[PDB]
Amino acid sequence: AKKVFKRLEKLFSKIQNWK
């Protein structure tokens, strides 16, 4: 569907892994 928007939030979590 067009609700990949959720994956976007998961991307933010990736930032925490890099920090």
Short mmCIF file of N, CA and C in Angstrom, two decimals:
data_model
loop_
_atom_site.label_atom_id
_atom_site.label_comp_id
_atom_site.label_asym_id
_atom_site.label_seq_id
_atom_site.Cartn_x
_atom_site.Cartn_y
_atom_site.Cartn_z
N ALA A 1 0.84 -1.22 0.00
CA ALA A 1 0.00 0.00 0.00
C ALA A 1 0.86 1.26 0.00
N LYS A 2 0.23 2.41 0.22
CA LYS A 2 0.94 3.68 0.24
C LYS A 2 1.20 4.13 1.68
N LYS A 3 1.33 3.17 2.58
CA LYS A 3 1.59 3.47 3.99
C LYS A 3 2.98 3.03 4.39
N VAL A 4 3.92 3.20 3.47
CA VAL A 4 5.31 2.90 3.76
C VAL A 4 5.81 3.91 4.78
N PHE A 5 4.98 4.93 4.99
CA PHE A 5 5.23 6.01 5.93
C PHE A 5 5.74 5.48 7.26
N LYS A 6 5.36 4.26 7.58
CA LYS A 6 5.77 3.62 8.82
C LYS A 6 7.26 3.32 8.77
N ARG A 7 7.73 2.88 7.60
CA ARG A 7 9.14 2.58 7.42
C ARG A 7 9.97 3.83 7.65
N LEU A 8 9.38 4.99 7.37
CA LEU A 8 10.06 6.26 7.57
C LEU A 8 10.42 6.45 9.03
N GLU A 9 9.49 6.09 9.92
CA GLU A 9 9.73 6.21 11.35
C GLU A 9 10.85 5.27 11.77
N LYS A 10 10.90 4.11 11.12
CA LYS A 10 11.93 3.12 11.41
C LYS A 10 13.29 3.68 11.02
N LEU A 11 13.30 4.52 9.99
CA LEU A 11 14.53 5.14 9.52
C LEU A 11 15.14 6.01 10.62
N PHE A 12 14.28 6.67 11.39
CA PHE A 12 14.74 7.52 12.47
C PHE A 12 15.50 6.70 13.51
N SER A 13 15.02 5.49 13.76
CA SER A 13 15.67 4.60 14.71
C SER A 13 17.08 4.27 14.25
N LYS A 14 17.26 4.23 12.93
CA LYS A 14 18.57 3.94 12.36
C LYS A 14 19.56 5.04 12.73
N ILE A 15 19.06 6.26 12.85
CA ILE A 15 19.90 7.39 13.21
C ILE A 15 20.47 7.21 14.61
N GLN A 16 19.69 6.60 15.49
CA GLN A 16 20.13 6.36 16.86
C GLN A 16 21.28 5.36 16.88
N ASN A 17 21.27 4.44 15.92
CA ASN A 17 22.32 3.42 15.82
C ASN A 17 23.62 4.05 15.35
N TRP A 18 23.51 5.09 14.53
CA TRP A 18 24.69 5.78 14.01
C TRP A 18 25.25 6.75 15.04
N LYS A 19 24.38 7.29 15.88
CA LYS A 19 24.79 8.23 16.91
C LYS A 19 25.41 7.50 18.10
#
